[PDB]
Amino acid sequence: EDSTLRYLQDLLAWVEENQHRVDGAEWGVDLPSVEAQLGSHRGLHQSIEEFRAKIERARSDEGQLSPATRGAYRDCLGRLDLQYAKLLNSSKARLRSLESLHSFVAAATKELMWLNEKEEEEVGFDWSDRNTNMTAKKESYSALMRELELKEKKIKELQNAGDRLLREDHPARPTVESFQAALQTQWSWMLQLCCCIEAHLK
């Protein structure tokens, strides 16, 4: 009777609270925070997929109702199939977006650390007059240029990847943009460093 209506409304409420959960969730602002959101959403998404079994069971118990109540029951089933479809598609899209975000953020983080580490090294080296071997200094700078020429292509590859996500209207725009800005800033610092260095080689 009403224990029936209550069960269908319970399933509806579950779907509805999770729609709320998916719709309002964060994306992350750095590698560890994005990984956490992705990890968390993977479990939520599995749970949503698994929820289907409860709907197909409610669907199965269809033939258990008397003729006078099958109509209303099916109506409610239709609402449930509908809301669930919305939820599942929202959850898939969130997973997809989290995966592409994580991939981009992970690659950018790696290149930011490489750049920062390279800067430390090159700052440590004695480029000044105290180092009297101008030949050795020139050979080091050349080796640096060689490395940066390769690295620059990778950085460009990353910026483009970010642009693709934006063109895609990725819902984590702010995080993507902030990593694009971070990469460009670090690159400019590296370029600046190269200028300081060549000042000692003239």
UniProtKB/Swiss-Prot annotation:
Which positions carry Phosphoserine?
66
- Spectrin repeat ranges? 1-56, 86-170
Known tissue expression: Widely expressed with highest levels in muscle, heart, placenta and spinal cord.
Q: Where in the cell is it found?
A: Cytoplasm, Cytoskeleton; Cell junction, Hemidesmosome; Cell projection, Podosome
Q: What about PTM?
A: Phosphorylated by CDK1; regulates dissociation from intermediate filaments during mitosis.
Please give the clinical condition linked to this protein: Epidermolysis bullosa simplex 5C, with pyloric atresia: A form of epidermolysis bullosa, a genodermatosis characterized by recurrent blistering, fragility of the skin and mucosal epithelia, and erosions caused by minor mechanical trauma. EBS5C is an autosomal recessive disorder characterized by severe skin blistering at birth and congenital pyloric atresia. Death usually occurs in infancy. Epidermolysis bullosa simplex 5B, with muscular dystrophy: A form of epidermolysis bullosa, a genodermatosis characterized by recurrent blistering, fragility of the skin and mucosal epithelia, and erosions caused by minor mechanical trauma. EBS5B is an autosomal recessive disorder characterized by progressive muscular dystrophy associated with generalized skin blistering.
Role description: Interlinks intermediate filaments with microtubules and microfilaments and anchors intermediate filaments to desmosomes or hemidesmosomes. Could also bind muscle proteins such as actin to membrane complexes in muscle. May be involved not only in the filaments network, but also in the regulation of their dynamics. Structural component of muscle. Isoform 9 plays a major role in the maintenance of myofiber integrity.
How it assembles, according to the record, is: Homodimer or homotetramer. Interacts (via actin-binding domain) with SYNE3. Interacts (via calponin-homology (CH) 1 domain) with VIM (via rod region). Interacts (via N-terminus) with DST isoform 2 (via N-terminus). Interacts with FER. Interacts with TOR1A. Interacts with ANK3. Identified in complexes that contain VIM, EZR, AHNAK, BFSP1, BFSP2, ANK2, PLEC, PRX and spectrin. Interacts with COL17A1.
State the domain notes. Answer: The N-terminus interacts with actin, the C-terminus with vimentin, desmin, GFAP, cytokeratins, lamin B; whereas both the N- and the C-terminus can bind integrin beta-4.
Protein name per the record = Plectin
| Source organism | Homo sapiens
Give the classification, highest ranks. Eukaryota, Metazoa, Chordata, Craniata, Vertebrata
